[PDB]
Symmetry: D3
Subunit: 242 residues, 6 copies
Amino acid sequence: SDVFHLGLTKNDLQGATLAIVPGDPDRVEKIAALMDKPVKLASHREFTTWRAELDGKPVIVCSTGIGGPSTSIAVEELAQLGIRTFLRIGTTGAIQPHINVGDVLVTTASVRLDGASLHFAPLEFPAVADFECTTALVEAAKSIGATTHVGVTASSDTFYPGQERYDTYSGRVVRHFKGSMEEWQAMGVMNYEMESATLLTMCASQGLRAGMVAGVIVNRTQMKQTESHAVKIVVEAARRLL
Amino acid sequence: SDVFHLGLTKNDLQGATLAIVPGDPDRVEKIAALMDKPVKLASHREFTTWRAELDGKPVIVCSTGIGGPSTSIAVEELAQLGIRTFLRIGTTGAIQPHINVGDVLVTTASVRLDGASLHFAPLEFPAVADFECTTALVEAAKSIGATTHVGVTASSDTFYPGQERYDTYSGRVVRHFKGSMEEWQAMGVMNYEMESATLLTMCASQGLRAGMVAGVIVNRTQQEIPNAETMKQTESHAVKIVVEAARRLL
Amino acid sequence: SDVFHLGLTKNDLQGATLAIVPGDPDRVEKIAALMDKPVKLASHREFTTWRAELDGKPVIVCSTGIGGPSTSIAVEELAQLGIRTFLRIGTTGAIQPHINVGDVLVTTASVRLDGASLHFAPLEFPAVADFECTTALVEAAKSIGATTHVGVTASSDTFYPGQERYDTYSGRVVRHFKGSMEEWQAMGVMNYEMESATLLTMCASQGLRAGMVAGVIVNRTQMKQTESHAVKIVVEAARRLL
Amino acid sequence: SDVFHLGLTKNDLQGATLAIVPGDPDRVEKIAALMDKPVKLASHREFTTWRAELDGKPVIVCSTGIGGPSTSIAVEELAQLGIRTFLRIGTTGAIQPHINVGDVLVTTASVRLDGASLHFAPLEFPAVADFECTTALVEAAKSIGATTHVGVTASSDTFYPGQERYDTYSGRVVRHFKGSMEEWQAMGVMNYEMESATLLTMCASQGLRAGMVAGVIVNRTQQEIPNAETMKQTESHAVKIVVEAARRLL
Amino acid sequence: SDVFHLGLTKNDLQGATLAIVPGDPDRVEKIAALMDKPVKLASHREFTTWRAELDGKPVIVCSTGIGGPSTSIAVEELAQLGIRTFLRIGTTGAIQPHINVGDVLVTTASVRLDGASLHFAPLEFPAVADFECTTALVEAAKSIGATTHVGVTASSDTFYPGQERYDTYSGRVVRHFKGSMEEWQAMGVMNYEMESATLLTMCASQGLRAGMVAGVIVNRTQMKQTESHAVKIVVEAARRLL
Amino acid sequence: SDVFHLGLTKNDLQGATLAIVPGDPDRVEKIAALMDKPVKLASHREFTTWRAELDGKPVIVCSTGIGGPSTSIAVEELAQLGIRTFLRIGTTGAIQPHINVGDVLVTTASVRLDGASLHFAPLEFPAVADFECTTALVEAAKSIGATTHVGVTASSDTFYPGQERYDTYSGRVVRHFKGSMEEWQAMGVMNYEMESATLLTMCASQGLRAGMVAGVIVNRTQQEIPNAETMKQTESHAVKIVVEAARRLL
Ligand SMILES: O=c1[nH]c(=O)n([C@@H]2O[C@H](CO)[C@@H](O)[C@H]2O)cc1F
Ligand SMILES: O=c1[nH]c(=O)n([C@@H]2O[C@H](CO)[C@@H](O)[C@H]2O)cc1F
Ligand SMILES: O=c1[nH]c(=O)n([C@@H]2O[C@H](CO)[C@@H](O)[C@H]2O)cc1F
Ligand SMILES: O=c1[nH]c(=O)n([C@@H]2O[C@H](CO)[C@@H](O)[C@H]2O)cc1F
Ligand SMILES: O=c1[nH]c(=O)n([C@@H]2O[C@H](CO)[C@@H](O)[C@H]2O)cc1F
Ligand SMILES: O=c1[nH]c(=O)n([C@@H]2O[C@H](CO)[C@@H](O)[C@H]2O)cc1F
Ligand SMILES: [K+]
Ligand SMILES: [K+]
Ligand SMILES: [K+]
């Protein structure tokens, strides 16, 4: 292995330069299955990697695990191996009334509620997605007729307090985040997820292209099939980025 | 006047919902001149407004003056008057070697080195441009064949220390900004300008669409010898691009 | 032109070392008119400059435009041309009950609600006015018998949310500034304006003397003539500073 | 499942109130194997859970995955299930010369270089370990004669820049973290790891007891030449120490 | 004098390496009196120093005065003189219902509501006590059967607003600290005092061992004898640390 | 006692509304001695209080001890007792070449390097002195012909690292303060002391008038060789100046 965590060698990628990075290890195979000659490369910790062909071009699929920390490791090590483009496919919770479960969301930029993005650029730097990847994702979504929403996403280091959930053990939310969801709502933020801030920031500040798309599995103001459409959309986007 | 600073009435706009907002008052007429039936509406402080027609649709052109403060006033008051889409056309200094004077830059999002954006959203919120406006700007730039670059822009509250210029009275830059340009360069930031952070943040957090395009009049990594001609010509292309973008946004 | 924005040459100032800097371009001529041999020097963007004589000494009057950004450019470029003393005359909104419209306010120091001051000194540095300029302004105000108030001023980068105005398009104020006016009131702050923080900080941290005086055109807790008195006061102060 | 991610039910724990939480899923079974009647309960995402008996008391072992985010989920959901005591056993990089690979480190408190801890308490709150858990860990380490060091640990959201590693794709470290390792060294910080800040803070601020122990697999001040054997042996001792500590905490 | 403030010479300490540092000058003699051959060494400003013997080992007792500023001076200068271990004995206000006046509190780490700790380490660094000193204090407390509580302490630069007291001249608390006590309570913080944050941080970040124990003289949610027990406990702890 | 720390009763002040507040308890009597009918009122912790008459008006003199924490207690409790005006007289270290030992410095505002001021107003609020008190101090200094300097002062919570002193036990200064003195120097800051930030902020934000004057006992830019005599003489003039200022403020 040429990297510390992924257990992958440069040759394993066979010249691949684009990677689809879902958060859940169990989704890696599903994504690879939509492409040609899918093969499992490695599985260590929360990092599962598969290789496949798209239009005769080798493509990588690697899980990041939940959170910016594990995400930064995967992205960094994949970059060390030649990957220059990253497309994240995730699951998300909508916080706007007009957005419905099943809808697909494309992130233009993210509210940085994480700590890892700060290890690449100060807070004033935008966690913005690459224009080409965003475009590809939008078109891909349109190509299959999925109800899509494009905009800002709140990327949190926590699933609970950071997303102002009170149905918890403590049933309490620290002051900084109390009343925070309502604030994001009034600002037009579409959803909550946990890896885009780190992904977009570290990529945008290091010459790497990144895109972000997620399927709505829940709406805070009010599933397997939704994941399916989002997966197709990201593979279709990758195709347009090759 | 229905607003405190612009000296404009709702009726003046004749139903206009899009405005092109240059920083310099003197550029307002130039921009309006590329459209039909251009008419001056008002002039107060650094706020000069003109109205014109584009494809049979009334369009506004209003100068913001330099900086997020004056920019936030103009945008806020124009919004009070019905404007929902804002396209900024400015001048900028490139900080990357591969970018040349005369090139056109489209901002996807901005590094917030201003104070006004913070009056609309905390620092963690991205100063991102509207996807539709950015797309229109990109296509418009392509439509006339201008050498274009798309990416991140550093928007500063100051022309000098914030952009780490030392050719100043004090010849000194406060610690926070010392060595800052090099940091931005390593991060891929394309340029320095002074209104996008405020514009994009206040719009993105209030349901308003905004786009940002600027012409390169200088490159910080490549010494000098400016050319009023070339410079005036660069402004020309950027103006044409923003008007073309507006057309696609109407 | 020896500077990038002002369109002025060192010789234009004829040895002037003090400048009165109003925010509104249209007020420049009014101020110059109270002095001798007033002459317009230039007009570019929001920067209008006039020269005049006061007690046989050349004095500059230059508009800064609204906000610290344009203010820092004007001050910096004027300094490059020899100006060492700056007196700002502005308009302001009082936030204390005992202060009335028409009253004149002299700022001793400012609450930094701007971004430009930070480009000269970290937030912990005080946006304090020069003792000599403050003194001159106080005496000048007294010399004409104007009802005067001396104290702290809140200098905001925005006219609306930063000054907690809700009569706006969004009718909303970001969390950081919600309930902020009341806080300033309890702290004795006298008013809101938009250039003193940047002016005083950049001057106080660069060996430049600065003073700040403004006329109250509105009281948040409850016009042409007020501007008139403030203008006289600043010209009278300049006279004592020459 | 009574929780959203762990896929566990209250009944699965059989009254367990203490959990050993390693970062790597693959270590869960190893830890459970040192106890009695070890049984796998679930495996979802980076969360692998096993149950076992220690002195006739049911004990849980659950992987957190790398980082405070996944750690906070696991801890929160385990707490929802009754766990009140958490003992983390990890791997770490030493940054002090006197500390050797193979040594065991017990964290009294951590430098918060993460983002998740901030979602439980402001930065001024200390990421301190529970006194009882720390004591148990210290005694346990002593009971087997392991070379131990007790002190402060720097817990980072990143493996690379946050730990000031330059052997990377960009080969660059953002300003805030440039020269940071040397600063931590001068302050006596013993090591770098990636979950203690979040673990200790969220537990210390919510009435939950937590302890932290890690085996040194590398020393940043002493070049390299890792040894899978030694490394695998270090993990072994750390595991034994944490299980022994749990025993004293039951 | 070999130091600027304490008025002490290296020889005065006769090889002492541990010091008990109370906040009140008047408590120095009381503490020294429990040991052998107590002798007053100096008295300057709020810094009173005494020397004594404990198990044949010279020990120092020096008052820090109230607050991190004076505390940092005393600790720094004592360190310059050879002291490597510091045990603070103070008075404190409990903020938890289950803690009673008279109880003894041992601080494991502190919430940094001070400014001095920041002059030694950034805010993210923990104001944690030395494990050995904490252990000694716990055992010492047990040795005399004192009702003890071990945990986190909020160390404030102010006695009033920082501890959210409203019975003041202004009867007002700045926004940052409004509702702060309740927050600390929900987080399990045991008490409020004014020197531990600075003490623990500066020591923990400079290779110096420090411990912190205080007697509860008041409970915010609901005296000479309490001080007595705390003094014994700290002397007993020092004995175990020699 | 009507207050928790000062051990003073409202009656003790006999209607006094102004207090001179030195940092050192030992200076309280010296200051009181220049006035009429000086009497010691109390002595507790670092708080020593004396009362005296100035032009037939009762005046208080109370030591604050070193630092904003003890300073805030004294000021708060004195205010509870009726004091509305505070004049601080201290000792200071100059950081500018043109300032000499023995010179007197009047602070117009302070750089807030303390923590206590933040307990009264956020960092953006200026630690500015009262205009009337500053004026009185300036005139008083002039009245005796002392070489005076008026300007900004850096008020630090620490005597050593915060004032970037390396002649210490650790011989190290935390990153935030490394190279800080030079920055303050370039900004024109005249000196370092340890109570003005807290004093001016808490007073300026609570309707209390405050002034600040200090005598230079050392200049950081000009090596050393202190003189107890000169030093004791500098304190003398500063004391005379503050008493004279109080007289003009009564
Ligand atoms: O409400 C949600 N919050 C959230 O963070 N997610 C995403 O799905 C995972 C949480 O289970 C995280 O990786 C995150 O990216 C989904 C959601 F539905
Ligand atoms: O180097 C530059 N920096 C800069 O900020 N600008 C832009 O032009 C104006 C300053 O001249 C500002 O409004 C800003 O948007 C142009 C430049 F060429
Ligand atoms: O309420 C007010 N707020 C305010 O900012 N001002 C000042 O006048 C201009 C706003 O029109 C700004 O330049 C500012 O300095 C006046 C006011 F009356
Ligand atoms: O140098 C190291 N840095 C580090 O963070 N670790 C730990 O091991 C994992 C990364 O490999 C993280 O969970 C972390 O806790 C180990 C190391 F050897
Ligand atoms: O409520 C309290 N708050 C407090 O800060 N203290 C402590 O006792 C002194 C206050 O009088 C300070 O030195 C501090 O350490 C005691 C208390 F009882
Ligand atoms: O260099 C100096 N630094 C300093 O802080 N002081 C002042 O004198 C005391 C420290 O000796 C503090 O109260 C402070 O106000 C004097 C000095 F000479
Ligand atoms: K993870
Ligand atoms: K302007
Ligand atoms: K003190």
